Amino acid sequence: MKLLTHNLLSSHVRGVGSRGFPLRLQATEVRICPVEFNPNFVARMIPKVEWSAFLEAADNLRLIQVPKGPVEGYEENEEFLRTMHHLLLEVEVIEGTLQCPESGRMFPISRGIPNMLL
Template identity: 30%
Template sequence: MKVLTLNFLSCAVKSCKSSSDSFPLHPKDAELVSDDVELNQQLLVNLLPRIDWNALRTTSTELGFPQLPEQPPTAEELQADAKMLKDLHTLLMETQINEGKLVCGHCGHEYAVREGIANFLLPSHLV
């Protein structure tokens, strides 16, 4: 699972949806792999306004990446900054959680990630 994808996921438990603690999910015991992906500058710039920046800062720190700036870059800033483009590309597009868990900060439920695929099926008592 890409770090980019994690930015669009919250806990699958319905009663958690209204809690701000259910997003972002927190990686635990995460084994990361890096895919070699061609940089698509335009796609990154276009995706930027859809990304929850605060959540991405949290995820980035939790995965051991350097701290992201407090404010997201504007489209112009990102296009003009080759290093930031490369860094964001590496973090969002290339970095994958291959094994580990994703933990909800509200209910504490842990979702397993195996071979790069997160499983959000819930045990019956949580449905």
């Protein structure tokens, strides 16, 4: 699972809508899968990222070393964009669980696909 995917994920339950976000995380197997680095995608879609949800998600995944503020620019800072590319698009949660904050239902990330069945 890409970090951005759960960072945009919600809960499909009728009652919790549309406040089922953000999902709480758990990981027991973390891998790195290379992805082509297009800086236009990152530069455009950082403003789409909810930063408090990103910080609490990283805290759920034991990880702290992220920039704390919205990194907006003209794709000139290679280090920040590269690190966030590694986190969002390359850090993969192969195995784990997702718990919903407003309902408690758990979805198993099982190599590497979470389930969304009733």
